[PDB]
Amino acid sequence: MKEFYLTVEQIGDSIFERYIDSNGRERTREVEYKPSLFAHCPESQATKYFDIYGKPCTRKLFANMRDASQWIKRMEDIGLEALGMDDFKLAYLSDTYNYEIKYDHTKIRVANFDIEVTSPDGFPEPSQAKHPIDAITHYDSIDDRFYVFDLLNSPYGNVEEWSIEIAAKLQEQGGDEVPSEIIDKIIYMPFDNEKELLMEYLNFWQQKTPVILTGWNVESFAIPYVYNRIKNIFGESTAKRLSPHRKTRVKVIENMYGSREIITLFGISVLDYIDLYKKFSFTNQPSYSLDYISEFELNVGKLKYDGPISKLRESNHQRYISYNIIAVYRVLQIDAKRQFINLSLDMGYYAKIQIQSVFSPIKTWDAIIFNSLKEQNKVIPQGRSHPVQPYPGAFVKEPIPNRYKYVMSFDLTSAYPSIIRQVNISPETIAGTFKVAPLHDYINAVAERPSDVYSCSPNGMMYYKDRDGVVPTEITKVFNQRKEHKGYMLAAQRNGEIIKEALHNPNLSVDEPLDVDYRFDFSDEIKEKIKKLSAKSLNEMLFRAQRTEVAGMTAQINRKALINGLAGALGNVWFRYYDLRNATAITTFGQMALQWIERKVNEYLNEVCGTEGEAFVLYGDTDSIYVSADKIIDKVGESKFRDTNHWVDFLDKFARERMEPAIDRGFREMCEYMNNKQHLMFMDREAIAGPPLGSKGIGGFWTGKKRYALNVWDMEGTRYAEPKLKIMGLETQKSSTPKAVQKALKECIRRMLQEGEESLQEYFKEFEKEFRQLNYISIASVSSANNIAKYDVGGFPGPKCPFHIRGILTYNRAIKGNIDAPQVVEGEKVYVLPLREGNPFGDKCIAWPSGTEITDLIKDDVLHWMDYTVLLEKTFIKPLEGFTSAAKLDYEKKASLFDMFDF
DNA sequence: CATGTAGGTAGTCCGCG
DNA sequence: GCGGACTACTTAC
Ligand SMILES: [Ca+2]
Ligand SMILES: [Ca+2]
Ligand SMILES: [Ca+2]
Ligand SMILES: [Ca+2]
Ligand SMILES: [Ca+2]
Ligand SMILES: [Ca+2]
Secondary structure (H helix, E strand, C coil): CCEEEEEEEEEEEEEEEEEECCCCCEEEEEECCCCEEEEEECCCCCCCCCECCCCCEECCCCECCHHHHHHHHHHHCCCCCCEEECCCCHHHHHHHHCCCCCHHHCCCCCCEEEEEECCCCCCCCCCCHHHHCCCEEEEECCCCCEEEEECECCEEEECCCHHHHHCCCCHHHHCCCCCCHHHHCCEEEECCCHHHHHHHHHHHHHHCCCCCCEEECHHHHHHHHHHHCCCCCCHHHHHHHHHCCCCEEEEEECCCCCCCEEEECCCEECCCCHHHHHHCCCCCCCCCCCHHHHHHHHHCCCCCCCCCCCHHHHHHHHHHHHHHHHHHHHHHHHHHHHCCHHHHHHHHHHHHCCCHHHHCHHHHHHHHHHHHHHHHCCCCCCHCCCCCCCCCCEECCCCCCCCCEEEEEEEEHHHHHHHHHHCCCCCCEEEEEECCCCCHHHCCCCCCCCCCEEEEECCCCCECCCCCCHHHHHHHHHHHHHHHHHHHHHHHHHHHHHHHHHHHCCCCCCCCCCCCCCCEEEEEECCCEECCCCCCHHHHHHHHHHHHEEEEEEEEHHHHHHHHHHHHHHCCCCCCCCHHHHHHHHHHHHHHHHHHHHHHHHHHHHHHHCCHHHHHHHEECCCCEEEEEEHHHHCHHHCCCHHHHHHHHHHHHHHHHHHHHHHHHHHHHHHHHHHHCCCCCCCEEEECCCCCCCCCCCCCCEEEEEEEEEEEECCCCCEEEEEEEEEEEEEHHHCCCCCCHHHHHHHHHHHHHCCCCHHHHHHHHHHHHHHHHCCCCCCEEECCCCCCCHHEEEEEEECCCHHHHHHHHHHHCCCCCCCCCCCCCCCCEEEEEEEECCCCCEEEEEEEHHHHHHCCHHHEEEEEEEEEHHHHHHHHHHHHHHHHHHHHCCCCCCCCHHCCCCC
16 A cells, blocks of 8 residues: 555654554654755756746755754844744655545554543642543554443442443333443453552553544543643653654643643644534534533433432442443544544545644645645745734625515535636736725726736736646636535535425335435436435435535635635735735725625616616625615516425526626626636525425514524525525524524524514513523523633623623632532623622622533522523514514504494 | 634614704 | 723624
8 A cells, every 4th residue: 555644743853653554553653854945046057946936946955854943043043044844744745645545444443442540639730630540442444443441449439340241221120221232342340459450441542543633622621631641640751652753742731720732742633622613513502511512412411420420430330330331432423523634634645744734724724835835846935024914805895684485596516616716816926016906997988908918907917827826726626616515515415305305295104214415416317216205215215314514615615614614814914925905905805706796686677677776685795785676576476486496496497598707798797808728617506495385484584694494495506395494694593592592593584584463472472481491501691701800800700701701700610629510611602690699609790611400509599599580682673673673564453443442 | 822814784873954 | 880992702794
């Protein structure tokens, strides 16, 4: 096989690399790497190295990496550019793997682990590590085994061995319900003292040294706890055995009363699954406990146990250990679904970076671009210092707040990257400037044509047309991968709707799910077979299709994020190719594009409807337009339609066969105007929205910029079995909004859009009557606990103290002295409830760590003093008032002359 | 050590015979 | 109590 790296580190003048050799064996090696950097030299000097602007360079080959670094400083002091890759391990990877890396994940040791630490005196701080580690579960991907390390004897209790037999039993039979598919994969190892456990864990670690290390919160808890605990018991050099190169760095972040730390283990790539999840999932959760996320992702129940976690080992060691095992498995289950490790490996090896550097788009792109330029013997520029400077972004249209009955939306495929490719925006493709007119003059095609030689953006920049830029070149590659995967995702989505339609008429038979590839639209033959399948087989197929869609979503959305990240990095001062001329060339072009195409669409629709000056585009944001299709429907007359699907078909066809071609013509004209390199503004129909035919539903509404709701029947070619709400910005989409209020607001919206005012009023009335019976957590608001200390004046709120921070302070006073109450952690999420006047907490609100029940000591009083009236008013009624006044209807029947009668 | 800007809601403060 | 500045939190792109 082809060789590929696992990890790379620079330590002094040595590169330390772990890799897979040609026989698929894991190897390690130390290399005294001899780096090169470069300097401009005179034209006369014949060379094979040129900078990206074609200026000749001379290679400086160094004896060691220290000399290279030293040289960079001397050049800085002289005042001359020091070119080349200054992150030497990227150069090493580039020299060592001068080819497209094909890696085999089965050779990569991916470790997933989690530890337990009984602590009777509060949270067990990793920096102090003063309590025994009494359980570790460590899953190894190469062995496919869960290695369980169980402490039987501790100063907090001596316990019996854990029973795998009881673990496998159903919880309703007193077992722990450890999933049956991992029972045979568990290797259980009890220990009579902690030192032997830890010694054996280290020996185990040596034999099975993680390459990728993950788990839930491992970076902020498990890893620093294990490191510091081993350090305190055996000494630091023993602790350093967690690094295959025996080197670590201890990052101490000053949390103030007290503190915590991150440990860097050289030769390992730590990918904390919480960080992967936050970067790659595109969710905004109110809690990030493993219980919450597992139930969200997997629909599995919360791990239930009686009493506090500090007493679980002593009271029920059996359950303690099972839950340690299960917690580790749940991360594997989430990853089986989401495939973030696979994505990390894909992206890492594509870029030729340390795998943990996928968290940094700047590092990722720096490596991609360096490797691309190196292949052509070109030399990358020195990184420079720049002051932070705000710059303009997208255009968002001010909508008229209203109900909007029939709406069709369109937007640009991969807008900013397409702009980069169309205009040819790169550091080395800049050809000059032109004198800019006001943007509106370009939008209305009255400004002079910027150039008939170069490709232009309305920010004043000109670019070469006849040569490739490294930015366009490399952004196109990732874009094309993105496009591939989104096709797979959308096919699986369409495939899923077919299955949902068939589930309306399941067959009474015993059969199996069809063996199909869900990434491709089902053939007619497959669809015929599906119409005869049973419910059981159909439901299994739907699950598989949805998993295929999620996998495709992970792959496409994050490659989208990567290329959009390249456009943004051009406006980040730490990016090697930072340049506001290029950043603003993109955003300014985008502003012109949206407003140009608004004009063109209004012109076109007026023409075909035989009218003049009517406004068809009602809204747009960055690269999208929203078109009122009311006059389109009225032209033919609603009477002509047989059902909802018929008018949907009609608008679908109208957009495809009439509008999109008019849009393409409009954009081709814009392209000629800017004399761009390549026409790539492809604005395809997104949503088709309206009320069901014959209903009193309003179809949709806008309250303002970035705030609207649409009843959608077709989305990017997916014709839904059941209409789906597209809601943006409204309170239903906000993690700060209480969970049950999101639900109730969404149902208010559904009724408004699908059923009408009377339906809304009926629901509003019921919810108002039943509000007070909802579970307290379900109606608590959520917020992030930032800068708590800043407003903490003697345990009381300082000036300008935010509401949520005030609630945290109230909480801290209420739990003072109580050692079991969980502390609010700086930066983390909290539930928040308002409190009636005169409450025993002595303030207007309370807040506690999210994803948890509030400690039993104060829970009773919180429940007793909750202010339901404030809560209903602020979280539900006030947002609903916004929706309904915008839509021009009432959530409560207004008084009128009719009130005089008895109906 | 290092993607971007645009934009709405709701909080505190402060003015207000 | 209500409604402007000033701003934290948060989401749409
Ligand atoms: Ca635990
Ligand atoms: Ca788009
Ligand atoms: Ca699209
Ligand atoms: Ca059937
Ligand atoms: Ca868009
Ligand atoms: Ca109490």
